[PDB]
Design a protein around this motif. Structure first.
Motif, PDB file in Angstrom:
ATOM      1  N   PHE A  59       0.824  -1.197   0.000  1.00 48.60           N
ATOM      2  CA  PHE A  59       0.000   0.000   0.000  1.00 48.60           C
ATOM      3  C   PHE A  59       0.864   1.254   0.000  1.00 48.60           C
ATOM      4  O   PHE A  59       2.095   1.192  -0.059  1.00 48.60           O
ATOM      5  N   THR A  60       0.200   2.405   0.085  1.00 51.25           N
ATOM      6  CA  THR A  60       0.872   3.694  -0.045  1.00 51.25           C
ATOM      7  C   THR A  60       1.226   4.308   1.309  1.00 51.25           C
ATOM      8  O   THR A  60       2.397   4.595   1.582  1.00 51.25           O
ATOM      9  N   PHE A 182      -4.656   0.252   6.375  1.00 56.93           N
ATOM     10  CA  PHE A 182      -4.071   0.382   5.047  1.00 56.93           C
ATOM     11  C   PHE A 182      -4.746   1.536   4.315  1.00 56.93           C
ATOM     12  O   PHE A 182      -5.972   1.547   4.160  1.00 56.93           O
ATOM     13  N   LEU A 184      -5.338   2.995   0.973  1.00 57.65           N
ATOM     14  CA  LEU A 184      -5.271   2.707  -0.453  1.00 57.65           C
ATOM     15  C   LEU A 184      -5.332   3.998  -1.258  1.00 57.65           C
ATOM     16  O   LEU A 184      -6.391   4.626  -1.369  1.00 57.65           O
ATOM     17  N   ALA A 189       3.851   3.785  -4.216  1.00 56.12           N
ATOM     18  CA  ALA A 189       3.948   3.205  -2.886  1.00 56.12           C
ATOM     19  C   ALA A 189       5.368   3.325  -2.339  1.00 56.12           C
ATOM     20  O   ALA A 189       6.340   3.488  -3.080  1.00 56.12           O
TER      21      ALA A 189
END
Ligand SMILES: *[C@@H]1O[C@H](CO)[C@@H](O)[C@H](O)[C@H]1NC(C)=O
Lengths: 194, 107, 120
Positions: A59-60, A182, A184, A189
């Motif tokens: 994820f980012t 998380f 998104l 990322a």
């Protein structure tokens, strides 16, 4: 290249639910295989994302949380219900991605008598918003006749003495809960494993 | 306070068990209990810390169990160690109880 | 490793204030769930926990001896001082100070213990 994924789980002392500590995660490798197979995490139920196969996904802007609750309210921390913990202390949004992995911590967070290090918030006049930290401990007013700094009639403190007892039931023991939210996004990322 | 028999006896090679009940309502659920094989003369020592789990190093065959509120200490056929006493201790609602003393005499 | 040994006075007169200590080494006191205790045993009797200290300076005493038994801590020199007054002949016993590594393990390591008598 490595980052403290163990520090958030094996920390010295977690914070209370009314003062849950938030932590940003950046520049990590998703080694979640050793986390799921730790044989110590009791409730690994993750809503929206499968418990395993997290390594082949990254994820980012993932965050992290930390708090302790009781066994009966282990189910309360989830985007499916509320009423006592997700209504005044800490609520997860309905579109929350992650889970509330927790384990039994009845070995170093409880002591004989009353453990007053951890506390939770009592009833309040207003509803709690998602991802809100209510550090203020103002005296709750249950209607008219404002006490304005006095205790007693309809002016009980929002924080309540928890009283972690050593001998308790299966739903009354301390449980260290961590939340891996998380985020998104579509940006490049930064926390991505092999 | 916890209650346990006065003095359990037994012949060498046989199997024996020391009981430890929780008549008093001080315990909430009797979750944590531990025994101490107090060698008479110097100091007690830990032999089992949890209800069944035993600490490393000083452990050969000692074990224990608990069904509702009564703890136990299951010994193997080894009775020739010494004339050691055992003390069952557990967390109460306000204090730390230790029970009584049981002189485990071997024949 | 974790080693406990008592040091201090042994003989005392009735109606006085006893100060018994025990120097610990081989482990830390600020560890999560850590602490040291104090247990006594009269000759020919069972054990009874007097008091203990925790990591956060929490002085939990016995219900029968809440007023007299006051426990302190000193992490700088790794010393634990036990203050108790009103020396009675029934208090003649040996005092072992223990080590509470965690809440699950009850008094893992023990000490040698000294026979503190209360007489004239
Ligand atoms: C925390 O410590 C234990 C024992 O040292 C270890 O097994 C566990 O993997 C650690 N936690 C993490 C997240 O690595």
């Amino acid at each position: 290249n490595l980052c403290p994924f163990g520090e958030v789980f094996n920390a010295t002392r977690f914070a209370s639910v009314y003062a849950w500590n938030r932590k940003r995660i950046s520049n990590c490798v998703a080694d979640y295989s050793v986390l799921y197979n730790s044989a110590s995490f009791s409730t690994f139920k993750c809503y929206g994302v499968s418990p395993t196969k997290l390594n082949d996904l990254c994820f980012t802007n993932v965050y992290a949380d930390s708090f302790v609750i009781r066994g009966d309210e282990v189910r309360q921390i989830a985007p499916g219900q509320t009423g006592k913990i997700a209504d005044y202390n800490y609520k997860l949004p309905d579109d929350f991605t992650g889970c509330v992995i927790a384990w039994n911590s009845n070995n170093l967070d409880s002591k004989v008598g009353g453990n007053y290090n951890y506390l939770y918030r009592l009833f309040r006049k207003s509803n709690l918003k998602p991802f809100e930290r209510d550090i203020s401990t103002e005296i709750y007013q249950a209607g008219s006749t404002p006490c304005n700094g006095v205790e007693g009639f309809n002016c009980y403190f929002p924080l309540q003495s928890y009283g972690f007892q050593p001998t308790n039931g299966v739903g009354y023991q301390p449980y260290r809960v961590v939340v891996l939210s998380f985020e998104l996004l579509h940006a490049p990322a930064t926390v991505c494993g092999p | 306070a916890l209650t346990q028999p006065a003095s359990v006896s037994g012949s060498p090679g046989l199997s024996i068990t020391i009981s430890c009940t929780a008549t008093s309502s001080d315990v909430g659920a009797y979750n944590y209990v531990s025994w101490y094989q107090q060698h008479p003369g110097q100091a007690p020592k830990l032999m089992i810390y949890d209800v069944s789990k035993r600490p490393s190093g000083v452990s050969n065959r000692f074990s224990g169990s608990k069904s509702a509120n009564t703890a136990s200490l299951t010994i193997s056929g080894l009775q020739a160690e010494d004339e050691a006493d055992y003390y069952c201790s557990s967390y109460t609602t306000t204090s730390v109880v230790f029970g009584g003393g049981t002189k485990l005499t071997v024949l | 490793q974790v080693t406990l040994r008592e040091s201090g006075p042994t003989l005392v007169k009735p109606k006085q204030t006893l100060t018994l200590t025990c120097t610990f080494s081989g482990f830390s006191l600020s560890t999560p769930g850590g602490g040291v205790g104090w247990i006594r045993q009269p000759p020919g009797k069972a054990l009874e926990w007097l008091a203990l200290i925790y990591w956060d300076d929490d002085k939990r005493y016995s219900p029968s001896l809440k007023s007299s038994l006051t426990i302190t801590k000193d992490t700088s020199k790794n010393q634990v001082v036990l203050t108790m007054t009103n020396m009675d002949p029934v208090d003649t016993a040996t005092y072992y100070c223990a080590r509470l590594t965690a809440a699950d393990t009850i008094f893992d390591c023990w000490g040698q213990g000294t026979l503190v008598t209360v007489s004239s």
